Design a protein around this ligand. Structure first.
Ligand SMILES: Cc1cc2nc3c(=O)[nH]c(=O)nc-3n(C[C@H](O)[C@H](O)[C@H](O)COP(=O)(O)OP(=O)(O)OC[C@H]3O[C@@H](n4cnc5c(N)ncnc54)[C@H](O)[C@@H]3O)c2cc1C
Ligand SMILES: Cc1cc2nc3c(=O)[nH]c(=O)nc-3n(C[C@H](O)[C@H](O)[C@H](O)COP(=O)(O)OP(=O)(O)OC[C@H]3O[C@@H](n4cnc5c(N)ncnc54)[C@H](O)[C@@H]3O)c2cc1C
Lengths: 460, 39, 460
């Protein structure tokens, strides 16, 4: 029986943040990892996908570049691209390993399973601690009628673009994963059709900015079918005959592709984890029930990231890991923050706060401000606008409630919006902050001006 | 310091922020602090 | 017949913002422009320079792109580039004219001169108004021993890259202008030597982040010589023999180049404007004296932008124009905002608030937090992590005082910092905002954590 102050299961964004923070706070920590250090985000999620998207955007932008004199006959070596992707991933995961050891955290490789409230079994050996933090993450969610196989891919397989690009790809799911991977394949030369059950892509975010992203993707040749669901498929000589139907069911239609990417969600990795031997409550979907302190139904046992609750985002997991670590260390921390969401497509999509509908439901007197990128000098100097900023606020208190952005660098600009919400900023605070000219960030400032009908670069 | 909106509101209402003691979090001046001082 | 409530002299960023805001508040406006609508920023400043920088960065990044399989033999046609640059400028300047007209603003072409406290003369005709807003901008500052000519360019001439790139270029001045145009020319194939009189480039900004920018430029082959001044030159058969000398003087040295770019500053256009007939006070440097309300020594007469006071920045002029217009309209607005400054080189440089030295001078217990981009996952996915974020704050109150950034998108990230300062954020506020992962904006959050000695992705 080897003991520690804390045992962290999983070294993904959540787990390694928890391990490190706890260590900084004086705790003796043991971190357990069954696969690659760094979790999904660094190995088969955020990182490799962002890498591929950057290469795709670089290639894509050359078409606009011909417009300003850049002549070139681009040829993209997919094996070399995959190599760079692997290189980036290795650098970052090795980096996490050095951070853990540099902080004095003990790393044990193997699959950890609880055998009790405060005891874990790994490789037949027992380990105990005063506090446990469950950061097991999630995995690709299977879709009825589309079992993963040689022709039905999950996001991990989709990352391996060097294993041959299909001529025709069908993407199931209009969330961040489907959209990003759909655009990567499209830019790399494939025909791409994406289907989404809900009325609009990114059903969790603002419909207006999401629609603008969809139209932009459609302009690139990506066929997007909303209010449509995939029911099944039949493999024939000419390809996979996929059967589609209206969301609410009805007349069936068919589409033929070479491969299918299923990106309809994630399943928390909470089965076979010994939770039923420790008394840890799990909800119907597999998520470990937790409170703002990230505490489970069992005192001293915390759960964070994808294993604890949606949204299944990295920065969220990271912050949750810090909260759980701090409390395990004796502090009184709690998670009560605005969590932004970003889609790294081109244009990018980003959002934080309340959508127009959520604000209304919350009882606010909803008012909005909008600013198109077409009126942006910076957008023009970057090769041409394509997007908009929408701010949602209360017409009575002038409080900023939500921000949605579609355009280049949307992901970088949403942090300012996140800060604004945390600081309790009003639309006037945002409008009165002097944003640098010329920059894409100005769109947030002018959207705020537009909210008060006094934007300068557009007629009100 | 105070947020742009509060500084602007103070000028509008003729309130001198340097003479006020905010009742917000860490002494932060609130909009109501300004309105209260105004009349 | 035809009377006006306000006459705005100049349609640069300051002037057109003043005219438009005044029109929005119900004033009858007359805007006078002696040259191209849009002023320096849109015609020969911000816009054309940023367009050239983008083209150069697009070409430059292809070298890193070869690393991920993008093979090509890029060739940049300067004539085509110049045409695009011209297109971007025309599109925007035409947009300003459209906005002015759309707001009911009357545009008069000619050079305006005051002949009294509230009367202006343009082309022999007289116009009067209860309010006058002076937004005449500035012009390239001439340097002793280097009068502008065929071989000595100002920034305007340097913009015409399609008129023959010099084999060897000497840039005098390590400010935003010299650095940006210097990098453009270097990336276009010219050998570039840049001299700065001060000990470090961007002498008004943080020396640490500024130094990192200098090192990056030196890596590209730009020979930067700080603590060095240009004394003069003499045209010879093989080129211009320029005499360099230490800032303090002494050891004389000569460098041979084909062209000299003088970017040592600007001079406010306040002479021959009739200020002495109106009673408007001007300081020794030529700037129109104004208070926080942008009011001059003459009631009803305001001055904004470059003509009013440094820093000579566009977003500042735009805000000052809004304040002046609002005050001319009977409101009571004052300029008390944080003004960020951006250098659009690659990597970019941006800063806002107080440097360590200034914070110390103001009596704060200076403490800093630093986060290197080499530890950024997003930076790596973009093909290179080179830069850093430094936050300056007070150790006792935890109040944020300044933020300086060097790296990609620094100009976009600085907006978050400006808002943070405007909202009176503490380092804890900055660190607690959940920044999206992976993004470059995360560097601000982590720099804040580092300030508290608990950054995660780097040892503390
Ligand atoms: C293609 C794709 C792209 C994405 N892009 C983004 C993006 O751009 N931004 C974003 O915010 N999010 C993105 N996400 C989601 C993001 O990856 C997750 O939110 C994040 O990885 C969750 O962190 P985590 O620490 O909770 O879990 P995970 O990273 O999954 O890590 C859990 C770790 O625990 C290990 N583990 C599990 N069970 C055990 C056990 N019993 N014993 C020992 N070790 C165990 C796993 O091997 C793993 O390393 C993306 C996801 C995908 C699929
Ligand atoms: C190469 C270069 C790059 C730059 N890049 C940036 C950048 O990236 N970001 C930034 O913030 N700043 C930048 N600047 C500085 C920025 O351009 C100025 O701060 C900004 O244009 C100032 O606006 P303004 O309205 O005060 O003056 P100006 O834009 O100069 O406009 C004044 C206008 O008044 C007209 N005028 C003058 N006198 C009269 C008269 N008597 N009668 C009638 N009309 C008159 C002029 O013709 C002009 O159109 C750059 C400058 C240069 C040279």
């Amino acid at each position: 029986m080897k003991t520690y102050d804390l045992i962290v299961i999983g070294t993904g964004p959540g787990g390694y943040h928890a391990a490190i923070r706890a260590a900084q706070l004086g705790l003796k920590v043991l971190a357990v990892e069954a696969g690659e250090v760094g979790g999904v985000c660094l190995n088969v999620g955020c990182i490799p996908t962002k890498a591929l998207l950057h290469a795709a955007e670089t290639l894509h932008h050359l078409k606009v570049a011909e417009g300003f004199g850049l002549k070139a006959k681009p040829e993209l070596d997919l094996k070399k691209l995959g190599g760079w992707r692997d290189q980036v991933v290795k650098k970052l995961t090795g980096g996490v390993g050095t951070l853990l050891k540099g902080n004095g955290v003990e790393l044990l490789r193997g699959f950890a399973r609880l055998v009790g409230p405060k005891e874990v079994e790994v490789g037949g050996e027992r380990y105990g601690a005063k506090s446990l933090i469950l950061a097991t993450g999630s995995e690709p969610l299977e879709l009825k009628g589309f079992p993963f196989g040689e022709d039905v891919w999950d996001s991990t397989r989709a990352l391996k673009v060097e294993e041959g690009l299909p001529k025709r790809l069908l993407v199931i799911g209009g969330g961040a994963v489907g959209l990003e991977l759909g655009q990567v394949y499209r830019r790399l030369g494939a025909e791409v059709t994406l289907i989404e059950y809900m009325p609009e892509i990114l059903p969790q975010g603002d419909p207006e900015t999401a629609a603008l992203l969809r139209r932009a993707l459609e302009k690139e040749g990506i066929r997007v079918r909303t209010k449509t669901k995939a029911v099944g498929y039949e493999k024939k000589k000419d390809g996979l005959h996929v059967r589609l139907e209206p969301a609410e069911g009805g007349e069936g239609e068919e589409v033929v592709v070479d491969k299918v990417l299923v990106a309809v969600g994630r399943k928390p990795r909470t089965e076979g984890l010994g939770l039923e031997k420790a008394g840890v409550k799990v909800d119907e979907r597999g998520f470990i029930r937790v409170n703002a302190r990230m505490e489970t139904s069992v005192p001293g046992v915390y759960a964070i990231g994808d294993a604890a609750r949606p949204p299944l985002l990295a920065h969220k997991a990271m912050r949750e890991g810090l909260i759980a670590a701090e409390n395990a260390a004796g502090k009184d921390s709690a998670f009560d923050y605005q969590v932004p969401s970003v889609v790294y497509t081109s244009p990018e999509w980003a959002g934080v706060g309340l959508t127009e509908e959520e604000a209304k439901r919350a009882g606010y007197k909803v008012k909005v401000g909008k600013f198109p990128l077409a009126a942006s000098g910076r957008a023009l100097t970057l090769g041409g606008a394509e997007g908009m900023v929408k701010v949602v606020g209360d017409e009575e208190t002038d409080l900023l409630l939500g921000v949605f952005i579609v355009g280049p660098q949307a992901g970088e600009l949403i942090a300012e919006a996140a800060l604004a919400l945390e600081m309790g900023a009003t639309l006037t605070d945002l409008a009165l902050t002097v944003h640098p000219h010329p920059t894409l960030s100005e769109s947030l400032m002018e959207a705020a001006e537009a909210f008060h009908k006094q934007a300068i670069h557009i007629l009100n | 310091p105070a947020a742009p909106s509060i500084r602007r509101l103070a000028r509008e209402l003729g309130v001198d922020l340097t003479r006020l003691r905010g009742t917000g979090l860490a002494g932060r001046i609130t909009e109501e602090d300004v309105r209260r001082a105004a009349g």
